[PDB]
Amino acid sequence: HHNKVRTCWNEGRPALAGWLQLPGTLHAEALARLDYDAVVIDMQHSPIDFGQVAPMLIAIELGGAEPFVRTQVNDPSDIMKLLDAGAYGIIAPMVNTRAEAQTLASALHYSPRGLRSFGPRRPSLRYGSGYLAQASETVVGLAMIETREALANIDEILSVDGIDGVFIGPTDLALDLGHAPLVDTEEAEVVSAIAHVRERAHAAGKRVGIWCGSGGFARVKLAEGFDFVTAAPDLAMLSAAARQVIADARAL
Amino acid sequence: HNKVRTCWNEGRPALAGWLQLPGTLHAEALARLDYDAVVIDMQHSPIDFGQVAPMLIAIELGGAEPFVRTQVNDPSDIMKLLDAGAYGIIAPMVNTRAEAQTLASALHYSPRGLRSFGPRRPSLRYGSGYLAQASETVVGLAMIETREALANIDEILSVDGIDGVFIGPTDLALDLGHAPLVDTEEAEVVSAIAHVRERAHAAGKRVGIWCGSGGFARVKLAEGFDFVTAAPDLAMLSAAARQVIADARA
Amino acid sequence: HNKVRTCWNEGRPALAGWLQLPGTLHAEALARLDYDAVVIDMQHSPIDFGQVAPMLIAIELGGAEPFVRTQVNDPSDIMKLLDAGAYGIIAPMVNTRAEAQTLASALHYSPRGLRSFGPRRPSLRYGSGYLAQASETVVGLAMIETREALANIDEILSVDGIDGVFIGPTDLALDLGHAPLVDTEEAEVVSAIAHVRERAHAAGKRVGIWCGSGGFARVKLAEGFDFVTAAPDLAMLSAAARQVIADARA
Amino acid sequence: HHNKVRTCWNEGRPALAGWLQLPGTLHAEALARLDYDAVVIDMQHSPIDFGQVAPMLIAIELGGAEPFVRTQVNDPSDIMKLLDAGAYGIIAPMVNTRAEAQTLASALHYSPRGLRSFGPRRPSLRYGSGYLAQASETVVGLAMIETREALANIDEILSVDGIDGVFIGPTDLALDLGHAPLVDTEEAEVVSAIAHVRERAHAAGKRVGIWCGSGGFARVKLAEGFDFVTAAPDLAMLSAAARQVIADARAL
Amino acid sequence: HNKVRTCWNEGRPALAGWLQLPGTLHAEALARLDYDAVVIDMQHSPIDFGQVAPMLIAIELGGAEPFVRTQVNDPSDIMKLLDAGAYGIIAPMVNTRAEAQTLASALHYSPRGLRSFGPRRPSLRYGSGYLAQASETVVGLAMIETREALANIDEILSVDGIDGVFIGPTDLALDLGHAPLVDTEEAEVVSAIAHVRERAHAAGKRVGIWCGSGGFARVKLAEGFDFVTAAPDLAMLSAAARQVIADARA
Amino acid sequence: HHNKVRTCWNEGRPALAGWLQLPGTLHAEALARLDYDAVVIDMQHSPIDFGQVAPMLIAIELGGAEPFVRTQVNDPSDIMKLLDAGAYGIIAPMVNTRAEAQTLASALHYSPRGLRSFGPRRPSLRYGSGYLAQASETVVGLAMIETREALANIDEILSVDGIDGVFIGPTDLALDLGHAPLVDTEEAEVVSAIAHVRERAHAAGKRVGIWCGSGGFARVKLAEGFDFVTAAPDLAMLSAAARQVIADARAL
Ligand SMILES: [Br-]
Ligand SMILES: [Br-]
Ligand SMILES: [Br-]
Ligand SMILES: [Br-]
Ligand SMILES: [Br-]
Ligand SMILES: [Br-]
Ligand SMILES: [K+]
Ligand SMILES: [K+]
Ligand SMILES: [K+]
Ligand SMILES: [K+]
Ligand SMILES: [K+]
Ligand SMILES: [K+]
Ligand SMILES: [K+]
Ligand SMILES: [Mg+2]
Ligand SMILES: [Mg+2]
Ligand SMILES: [Mg+2]
Ligand SMILES: [Mg+2]
Ligand SMILES: [Mg+2]
Ligand SMILES: [Mg+2]
Ligand SMILES: [Mg+2]
DSSP states (O other), rough: OHHHHHHHHHHTTEEEEEEOOOOHHHHHHHHHSSOEEEEEEEEESSSHHHHHHHHHHHHHHHTTTTEEEEEESSSSSHHHHHTTTTTTTEESSOOOHHHHHHHHHHHHHHHTTTTOOSSSSSHHHHHTTHHHHHHHOOEEEEEOSSSHHHHHHHHHTTTOOOOEOOOOOOOHHHHHHOOOOOOOOOHHHHHHHHHHHHHHHHHHOOOOEEEEESSSHHHHHHHOOEEEEEEEEEHHHHHHHHHHHHHHHHHO | HHHHHHHHTTEEEOOEEEEOSSSSSHHHHHHHHSOSSSEEEESSSSHHHHHHHHHHHHHHTTTSEEEEOOOOOOOOHHHHHHTTTTEEEEOOOSSSSHHHHHHHHHSTTTTTTOOOOHHEEEEEEETTTHHHHHHHHHHEEEEEHHHHHHHHHHHHHOTTTTTTTEEHHHHHHHHHSSOOTOOOOOOOHHHHHHHHHHHHHHTEEEEEEEESSSHHHHHHHHTSOOOOEEHHHHHHHHHHHHHHHHHHHH | OOHHHHHHHTOOOOEEEEEEEOOHHHHHHHTSSSSEEEEESSSSSSSOOHHHHHHHHHHHHHEEEEEEEEESHHHHHHHHHHHTTOOOOOOOOEOHHHHHHHHHHSSOOOOTTTOOOOHHHHHHHOOOTTHHHHHHHEEEEEEOOHHHHHHHHHHHOOOTTTEEEEEHHHHHHHHHOOOOOOTTTHOOOOOHHHHHHHHHTOOOOOOOOEEHHHHHHHEEEHHTTEEEEEEHHHHHHEEEHHHHHHHHHH | OHHHHHHHHHOOOOEEEEOOOOOOOHHHHHHTSSSSEEEESSSSSSSSOOOHHHHHHHHHHHTTTTEEEEOOOOOHHHHHHHTTTTTOOOESSSSSSSHHHHHHHHHHHOTSSSOOOOOOOHHHHHHHHHHHHHHHHHHEEEEEEHHHHHTHHHHHHTTOOSOOEEOOOOOHHHHTTTOOOOOOOOOHHHHHHHHHHHHHHHHHEEEEEESSSSOOOOHHHHHOOSSEEEEEHHHHHHHHHHHHHHHHHHHH | OOOHHHHHTTTOOOOEEOOOOOOOOOOHHTTTTSSSSEEEEEESSSHHHHHHHHHHHHHHHEEEEEEEEEEEEOHHHHHHHTTTOOOEESSSOOOOOHHHHHHHHHHHTTOOOOOSSHHHHHHHHHHTHHHHHHHHHEEEEEEESHHHHHHHHHHHHTTTTTTTTOOHHHHHHHTTTHHHOOOOOOHHHHHHHOOOOOOOOHHHHHEEEEEEHHHHHHHHHHTTTTTEEEHHHHHHHHHHHHHHHHHOOO | OOOOOHHHTTTTTOOEEEOSSSSSSSHHHHHSSSSSSSEEEESSSSSSOHHHHHHHHHHHHTTTSSSEOOSSSSOOHHHHHHHHHHHEEEEESOOOOOOHHHHHHHHHHHTTTTTSSSHHHHHHHHHOOHHHHHHHOEEEEEEEEEEEEHHHHHHHHHTOSSSSSEEEOOOHHHHEEEEEEEESSHHHHHHHHHHHHHHHHHHHHEEEEEOOOSSSHHHHHHHHHEEEEEEEEEEHHHHHHHHHHHHHHOOO
């Protein structure tokens, strides 16, 4: 028993992860069974509530990927309930300051390293009675860097011992820097900001991840040395596939 | 108006989506594409009645006609779906004239059928004039997917109150002793499919089929199918994800 | 005690609510009014089994007897509702003595019927003595809503184990070739309703009916109906909202 | 495509809205189809959770009213997830200070006018790819005035550019001022407070709304020049209608 | 591999859990204990299809084979459960050879049965080779719980495609005119149970039974039952809570 | 109509309560029907979301125990929505300071004693139109003491008028004091801390509760004079009962 993403990193390999915005277990299991190391459930920009995330985490684990959640907000009590429901990866949006990164770290570890409340319903079933001793290793925590403010604060954020590193939200970052909501961009200012965050993460001996909208862009990010790359949202892949089926059906 | 009936009345076939995943977000998103209808599969999916109800609403808001492929040809199940705003019904494994008569009985009020009266959602869409035009608001297709159905095709097509038939080519292939392959080239299955189509059109009825690709759907439209579905949500998403991963991993 | 049976044993009819909206808050709130029973409609509503279960609990806490009008006269569906704490069953479209016998078979343990034993919620309410008094805890009504049922009334009423019959006057009006109007004045429908009532009372059975207004319910109570429902939640809420809007907009 | 409430206001007309405390799609659609411009779903004083609100917003839009939510609390991340689920009106309870009104404004607009996170799942489907350019206009935001403290701070609250105005909670206001929980009151002190808030809202070129328990009271509020009037809660109208049916059924 | 079939192929019986409570947390937790299978009861529980679906996934992750005791022996209900990853089916009240043939028809693809093809979850577990080995992945047991079933035992056991029979001793006791007691000592019921066991083993079939205690389950295993369930989640939890309260209150 | 726990306390009797971590109504009703005065639903260390807690509160009340909730976090708006859903007992985890105890008190009372928002959907049905006058008595509020920090602050926490007292989280307390996650412990340091909290609660004329993992430990806590004792979690009792059934089934 081990965190599949931590196993990638311990073997000097990056992790590739899925991204779900659609509630339900069937597609969660089917995607987890593909060559994804993790599958992230998006609880920020989706209609997925806690009652719907709980059985999705089970389905991903059965499919053979590490269950991750991108939370609605950086809130310790929300993050703790997800950990106890068998979320083994947490990505907290809009972490703009060292203090906010400490708030995330506080949720991911038991005392004395954090203030995580004890009652691990699903981790105890997966890991057994030996869980508390290894609990910190079973969990991956990434602070999202999505703003001018987070970019300015990146060295202070990376100095927080309890987070594994940072996950870049490139569309919110492009918007905050005064651009359109650019997806998978080469825009020089946005790309220089993202390169800066990766360079500082690795200099600090921390991990860096990035959200991607396509397989093509994910290959570029992996080939730049990102540690955790997501591609691409279930609803986006499904809509694109339907549009293409319809286009081919209705062609002369 | 029933968007599929509007296609037909205007001399055009209908192209439909096919959902095996529960939920409203992809249902609305696919309904807003160039689909005339979106079918929710209650047979080969985890979708129960509590989940189908909001999906019907989402499809209608997206601007496609909501259809349901039911778990079974059962009149009371069909009547509850109709009153929940399912405006097309595809009933699996209709094998006999009696079974086609059971389907027709569910889709029409007395004296044409025995549909129980309590049209919760259709009354909201169509108003107090609903009863008079109820029959035309609903499209009903009996599924031809066995040797027995294929043997009994003319008598199934004889039943007034069904709009026509919808081929289940994987179940048909399997019952003919062939592999249940999507979009099959198997000569006997392809000949059985063309026979059902010709028989439906000769009886003044409509015919539909399930497809797994845009390419196959283009052929069935060209061959004169009236209602073509392509392709299942879970299949399309799985194949897309496989491609993304293969692109990403180089 | 079954509150409806207590009304009957004390020489009083029962007045019931009628829910087509899922959820527990209005179910408890209507149960706390001067209703003896609240019926949950699983036929002409979006309510599935997962939603009916907590509604039964809410009605019982509010202090009305929980009833269910099932989607269909199916023994296994009725048995699951009984074991979930439905203490009244109204089965739609009971047209023959055989169909009434199917309903009675579901409502009684061997040797009277064939009800499967596993009474999850009734055992909590009634304790370990439940089996001996099980029959008296449940009220079962066959719906008379077709020409065929009306023709077969005496033989439906002959079936021991059903408490009596419940008229579906909109389906009856429609099957008699009339408008399916709530609370109809149509002479033949009104005469058919009085006939069913007289036949039930002559057979020593109970009779109920669906009403759309307090005024009509008052008449049916005065005419000697034993179980009168008025009026559906969605209808009452819709008419109330229309009035509020008309008041507000001046 | 336009916000039906904003269209009323642009045409110098007030908006009349429904108020739901009962979960489910069928009554939501049926009421939306009546002569209501909007229907508000109450997530503060109801058992409605996020999983239940999501399909109700769809049902209201299909019925042809603008979907609104009265949120449980003034929390930016909760408000953002509702916007991305196709809530086009937000009413945030207990907004007592200018700082709290700024917190609400921050959630309702993308950078640089706010800090709303980008991922508009349902608005993108309703409005298309041209959504970001008009996003602020598609959304109506009202701060609730329900306390002595909010009343004292009304000019500071109204000075916040990012809110369309204020929505009065007359029962909580009556309670905070030391009265019984008065519904649709003429009580001189409560009525003078409410008149003050309307006068200051209109002086500031802002909109003012009020919650009503009856059609009669809603007519009075509309005829005083309120911009957004709700009447009346589904559970209240249903209970009153049932009581009257029973009273008529059991009459001699 | 089907874990129960693996027990049988290795000359061992299977011990199973029994859930009447909906939800995934206790389902996974009991599946991780020394149970070979966990049965979800859809007959005497509030569990609907929407709730059973995630429970099947939880049991499989816990490392027990997921089974379902269905509400009724209905082919379309069984086929939807199979496609949702129910790998054992126990059908209540199988009373005749015809009813056993109806069960067998649902569990096998043509030409052995008439199972409709669309194996959503089994295809994920078993891959594209699923069709060829489908029959062996599923365990099907007909319930013997009436006088009529007991009378028709040899002809039920004659049906190829059913793995064997599962005794419902409380319904059997009640239909024989005895108390529906868990783990009964009633001489005629005990003799009926041993007869069904001997008949199943003589026909080369498997036999199972429902138990209420570890002590009784130990005896049935020793007597040579192939599939023993003990004990229902709600019963075990209720008795445990009663003990805790009695300990606490002194 | 009365709070069953307050009735115990008014009659000089302690209350014994159940503890649910499993969603659903059937076991909630069955346990409520046993000799428990209350049943607590755990929304911190369970997968229970608001949509699942709502019908469980109904089931417990019908079974004839007082419905309690141990909340995910000490958040006033979450606590208010539970009160309006017919939670009549609130246990808020991780209350570490007098200020946090005041935050809990603020949620449990209407103005002027608190700032609870008015809209009591279920309490109004249970208690009728006379509810506001007795509302404070219908509700039991307990602040959880689970940390070194809460222990140091126990006299300041107990000085908050609006809480009935404190509920000890012995496992989180043992962890915070540097021990293993000890369940039902006699460990001298943890036991002295718990005895101190009980002694200070009773000296302050307040009530004290404690979570137990067994019937045996609950008897000891009752016999020490605790006012509110819980035993034992549904999932723990069910797992132990299954293990024993299996052990007996597979015995030689
Ligand atoms: Br792959
Ligand atoms: Br398109
Ligand atoms: Br009343
Ligand atoms: Br209107
Ligand atoms: Br074990
Ligand atoms: Br007890
Ligand atoms: K994988
Ligand atoms: K369309
Ligand atoms: K359901
Ligand atoms: K009552
Ligand atoms: K409207
Ligand atoms: K196991
Ligand atoms: K009790
Ligand atoms: Mg972002
Ligand atoms: Mg088929
Ligand atoms: Mg009817
Ligand atoms: Mg929920
Ligand atoms: Mg208020
Ligand atoms: Mg049985
Ligand atoms: Mg704790």
